[PDB]
Design a protein around this ligand. Structure first.
Ligand SMILES: Cc1ncc(C[n+]2csc(CCOP(=O)(O)OP(=O)(O)O)c2C)c(N)n1
Ligand SMILES: Cc1ncc(C[n+]2csc(CCOP(=O)(O)OP(=O)(O)O)c2C)c(N)n1
Ligand SMILES: Cc1ncc(C[n+]2csc(CCOP(=O)(O)OP(=O)(O)O)c2C)c(N)n1
Ligand SMILES: [Mg+2]
Ligand SMILES: [Mg+2]
Ligand SMILES: [Mg+2]
Lengths: 567, 567, 561
């Protein structure tokens, strides 16, 4: 096979496991989209706008491990940067590829469409560098293979997005062919002395600390260490809790799992157990303002073993070049049984998380009953995409059967992420039962991507929580800016179906205002195999989780804290 | 009055003539939105998402001369950058204001929500610098007045957008009060020797060049020179044509106006007249790939007097510090009558632009009949917002009564601009008859802002041209990426009306598939004073202007031209 | 004439008043330098290295108002960027012009010499943006006129440096001709309503505040407001003090001048007078960690009228678009006598700054005796260039006759600035008596530029203070890094003469030898004279010792939490 710039790119994308890429056409990328189309192992999937394109790829990367979005110069790329910064924040290897000017137009005093009106076309690459792990511009075909391979290998190694731009007049130009896929995953092994030392220091730290807790963090999947963490936890026999953003990164039917650790909104018993543990082994955590409940819940530095994806800090020593999967595997082999924290937890009799009983059939639907019927739908083959909003807290409360997944975007927190993310996740994982839980406010930012779920016949079940505005903001600091224009969300499904011809779309929009209506809507949803089903769930503005009220206050307090003295 | 950081900002915004600013709430900006709310001379207007917020402000600036958009850190700002780069490209002073972290969180090793996961919060400011004329971060209240005043004065002087970020814990902090508004508009006068010299060189250039044409450019309004250009044109008595993006920047009922100059898609006679003029006086032009019809129509460097907003290049000499309004005023006083090109044009008998007759009532609607009935609606109090797409060419063909305005975004060309731009323009110019002409493809990127037109009861008349995909791209280079998922656009209006209660919205969605149905829909539209009216106009995919086909080919040719030899 | 990119630039430089520009050749700028040589209204002056080239321009801008430096791509420009940041810090319009790659090598996958080994040639320009007021790359001739005019106007407007790069294959290419010089000096006027209101608010503020002190700041010359400050001071009749970096920006023989304000190292009576004043009118100040003596001396916000070059903050109102020269001119016309702080100062009997009597001729030379003899050299036609180090404090103690200038680089504080800065200043102001006061440590960074003073026959008198290392650092925080390799500094003159040069190098180890050396220096009209003065490491001003401790305490203060 002879390759071109564009087919080289396509082949590399297929080699890292992509079966799809996402795109929005524009004149600087059309020839490149033609070359990408030429690859018989990938589908090209079209999006409504470039933010949504970016977020669709982000969601795909959650299903498949990586993804790619293709956009046009400047007008496409700048909005897509928002999503790419999201991918950086969520440790996902999304490859952003932009069209770019004709290579003759550089340093030529040419003013070009889509650009600033100046004759300088480096600004986009410049901007990209701030929000990616690698960023390259391809101006000539000879430089294409090296630049492509560099950004792909970096994305996969770092679990971060990357940027490529390609001149619009070279995508069909010949270049070298790509070598074997195995080269792209090539990575450092753990330094063996370091691995051994980190594990041994961990044993010397816990030799006389029998109450050991394990804190599962939101970078565990990025480190491909989820399986190793179960092995470690089973050997240790300690208490295992998840940070809020790590929901589903540890099997909840495992007898060592005690629930969520999230400060004053932890599951019952957990906060106590963590306070009175002698050692906390944290596996790939992100400690931020949200995850620490407005800086009120910070791990005790005297007890913390900090095992990150590529380093361990233990017993006052930093060990770089120790991969978490390797650390956990070896530690699982060497560690003795340390059941103390878990014994402490059970002796608490703090009970299980208190959950409401089934609602009466005709009563007004409430937040707690929606959460109950959703929890009832969960299977080992289910993924729930949970938006920023009260849905964060509802999803957190659900008991997951082993195998069920939850997808959160808690580090970036872009409301509206969820709709294109669920689209892209559903493209990538069509075998799964894919459930989207999204608030009305969020939905409005990105709603149009539901039309793509319709176009592709994806059977996503969408729970749209219609509480008439931004209830999480209401619980941080209220004002007129938290009110939104209400829509007939259910009716939007018919809009996306088109001229309404039978072949034009099989989306369904339903309304649920009672428990009985919700039951019946769920039934219709599960039977709709040809398209998405949006269930518009009606509840009161302030009918939210107890957790949200408490977390919201501590967040408003951290954000507003006064400046300290600087002289 | 005692001021705070935030009320200082609000007051400056009011002083430059804003009566509105646009916003999307988020926790890093809520206190700042409260301070901005405290100003009794401005409305705070909420948007669905941050791209749309940015574009709403862009549209407002077309109505009012400047604008402001307020967004949250990182998740809001990065998408809004797309719109801000648009404002830069279209020479509009939009002030982007972002919320930002608590000022205690800098250089503190704190990981914060909405950010990349790192502990460095300068990246947004860095990115902003590439697409603005000034960009400042406010970390302390003492630095607020200077930074605010700097970015505002720069925006107004340069007719370019600017960036401010404000730490979330200082918006209510006291600071100095603002001085008089007059300080903000303070600008250089023309250098008198330069002004005199530029005008005199222009007379010596045209002394023996009697066939003088005037080419009105898309930076004429930015230079506030529209009125001066009429004075000059009337004194000269030459032929005056507009570049495509300068439609409505010169009164079309003026007897010296000959139509559009746009290469092979010029109005009849114009191309000939420009070829055989001896001098072309270009007033604030932008010569780009689109405006030159894929580089096939470049002005003759031997004939060109180049009068830009702040400089004139004439008779081989560059004169900086000569303001276009001043140049035109003085030139109008000194120039003799030079009627030659206009005499040449009339002697062409090239006739007027050929326009179709009224359609039969029941026949399938065609592109040309939509253009006809829209042209029939134009009054001196009308503005037409014309999207990138075939709507560029339809709008170009319309005969404007003096006073009527057309708004184009031809330099940036972000499809979807038009919907939030029309929202913001209609907020700013509610007295006008505001008409939006938008294609189906474009509409899908930003459709949700129609809900804000509903919320605010704005009587915008929207002509949605439903030709089942991206017809302009079809005419550049066709592929599967130009097909889109069709919607029931008309039905979307009921969605935005909400629970459909009488007080919930007065948007109307109508369908037009024949000339008669279009007439009747226009009537209903004009009678709907309480909300927007969307008229979904159905036509064939390839039923487009002749102009688009011709321009599309030359553009595809310029974009794809082969690389030249570099050694 | 027909213009080229290069000659357009040349003409613009001549229009802004340059009679010289400074250069270091390299293959990417040679054509450009030829084009600059076409214009015979300025001379092209060559420098040893690009750091020194930049600082030569910086000192020329002190003498003439603006300057230019020309360097080669990457290897020249990156080091020159330290001088350009320096110019930005010191408010000087220096135009840095770099040669750049052939315009065919952009977006071509070509690796070029002097670059990073990649194929991207935008990095220099991106770097420059961080330290300039404007920065433009010229890749085609048709774009040159607008880019050139934009950076020049910007430099003059903002009083800051700017950056241009010009592709090496386009410098001789035709372009449009430049218009009138007048266009380049077209600044906005003050907003009249704001000017009037700011003056009116100032008159309100001081209505019942008779004890009015005037604090003269280091951005007064950038504001072109020195003459206006004298008019205001003469009308007001209050006490005037200069900030350290503003030495010579106010005539010291004026009866309203009370000396230096600089915290605990102020002239006697000044610190008290400032504390007693009811209003302090600060004229273009820069309040930084050094100028506030480690943040120990900050103006009382309740008494401060802050008149910056382009704005005034007074009575809790900010007034942009008010130019200080105009503010001072108007205020001088309107203000009534406010003598109270000057009465207070006199009433104090604090005395004049105490200064040492002549030393015993044959005793070992001491720092105070060096300062006394230099002070005795000062005339109205004198400029002293004072290096970072104890020379800052010795110069600060000198009583200037009206007309005498001091050049300081206190914001940037790059040791070694003084040598090429004195070279460039002496090229721009050859009529003046130009004295360089420079320490041994500083001298060693940039010494080679004395060879250019020899080449051009500039009669710069150089007092090299040989105190065997970095005393200013000894007095902040001592360690082995303050010791340097000693040189025979006097013998360096002969090296720079070659085997063709009239530099003189002399040694002074007593007061009599210093007296004799200075006579020889004054008689040497054909080249520079370096006088190597030997003093003990710790023989420094008392002021350095006090200010040093305060700086160290500010630098090392603990993180707050
Ligand atoms: C793009 C973006 N803009 C603004 C915000 C700030 N923000 C955080 S949660 C929220 C409200 C979400 O409302 P909804 O989706 O209705 O969920 P609810 O809180 O009502 O449960 C907002 C505006 C954000 N996170 N991202
Ligand atoms: C944000 C953005 N993405 C992609 C493009 C490329 N583009 C230019 S015109 C066009 C099609 C617009 O289609 P429509 O609005 O339906 O107008 P029609 O051409 O059918 O008249 C596209 C995708 C763009 N200009 N801006
Ligand atoms: C380029 C540069 N490097 C390092 C420093 C730090 N520094 C400040 S003063 C000084 C010593 C000055 O030595 P000298 O010129 O001998 O003067 P003295 O202090 O002995 O009077 C140093 C190293 C600096 N200011 N600039
Ligand atoms: Mg909500
Ligand atoms: Mg269309
Ligand atoms: Mg020394």
């Amino acid at each position: 096979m002879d390759y071109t710039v564009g087919t080289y790119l396509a082949e590399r994308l297929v080699q890292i496991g992509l079966k799809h890429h996402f795109a929005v056409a524009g004149d600087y990328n059309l020839v490149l989209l033609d070359n990408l189309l030429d690859n018989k192992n990938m589908e090209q999937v079209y999006c409504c706008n470039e933010l949504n394109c970016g977020f669709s790829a982000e969601g795909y990367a959650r299903a498949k491990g990586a993804a790619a979005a293709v956009v046009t110069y400047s007008v496409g790329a700048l909005s897509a940067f928002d999503a790419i910064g999201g991918a950086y924040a969520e440790n996902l290897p999304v490859i952003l590829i932009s069209g770019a000017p004709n290579n003759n137009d550089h340093a030529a005093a040419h003013v070009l469409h889509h650009a600033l009106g100046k004759t300088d076309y480096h600004y986009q690459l410049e901007m990209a560098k701030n929000i990616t792990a690698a960023a390259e511009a391809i101006y000539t075909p000879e430089e294409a293979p090296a630049k492509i391979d560099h950004v792909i290998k970096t994305a996969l190694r770092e679990k971060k997005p990357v940027y490529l731009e390609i001149a619009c007049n070279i995508a069909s130009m010949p270049c070298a062919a790509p070598g074997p896929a195995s080269a792209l995953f090539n990575d450092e092994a753990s330094d063996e002395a370091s691995l051994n030392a980190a594990v041994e220091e961990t044993l010397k730290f816990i030799e006389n600390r029998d109450k050991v807790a394990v804190l599962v963090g939101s970078k565990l999947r990025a480190a491909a260490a989820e399986e190793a963490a179960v092995k470690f936890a089973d050997a240790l026999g300690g208490a295992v809790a998840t940070m809020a953003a790590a929901k589903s990164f540890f099997p909840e039917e495992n007898p060592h799992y005690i629930g969520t650790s999230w400060g004053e909104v932890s599951y019952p018993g957990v906060e106590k157990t963590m306070k009175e543990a002698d050692a906390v082994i944290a596996l790939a955590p992100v400690f931020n303002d949200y995850s620490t409940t407005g800086w009120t819940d910070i791990p005790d530095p005297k007890k913390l073993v900090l095992a990150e994806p590529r380093s361990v800090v233990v017993n006052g020593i930093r060990f770089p070049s120790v991969h978490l999967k390797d650390y956990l595997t070896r530690l699982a082999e060497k560690v003795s049984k340390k059941t103390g924290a878990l014994d402490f937890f059970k002796s608490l009799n703090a009970g299980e998380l208190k959950k409401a009983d089934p609602a009466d059939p005709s009563a007004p639907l409430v937040n707690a009953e929606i959460a109950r019927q959703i929890e009832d739908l969960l299977t080992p083959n289910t993924t729930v995409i949970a938006e920023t909003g009260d849905s964060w807290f509802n999803a957190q409360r659900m008991k997951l059967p082993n195998g069920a997944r939850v997808e959160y975007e808690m580090q970036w927190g872009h409301i509206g992420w969820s709709v294109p993310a669920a689209f892209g996740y559903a493209v990538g994982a069509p075998e799964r039962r894919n459930i989207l839980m999204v608030g009305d406010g969020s939905f409005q930012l990105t709603a149009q991507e539901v039309a793509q779920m319709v176009r592709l016949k994806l059977p996503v079940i969408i729970f749209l929580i219609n509480n008439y505005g931004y209830t999480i903001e209401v619980m941080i600091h209220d004002g007129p800016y938290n009110n939104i224009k209400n829509w007939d969300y259910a009716a939007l499904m018919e809009v996306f179906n088109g001229n309404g011809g039978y072949d034009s779309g099989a989306g369904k929009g339903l309304k649920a205002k009672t428990a009985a209506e919700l039951e019946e809507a769920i039934k219709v949803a599960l039977d709709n195999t040809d398209g998405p089903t949006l269930i518009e769930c009606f509840i009161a503005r302030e009918d939210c989780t107890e957790e949200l009220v408490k977390w919201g206050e501590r967040v408003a307090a951290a954000n507003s804290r006064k400046p300290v003295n600087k002289l």
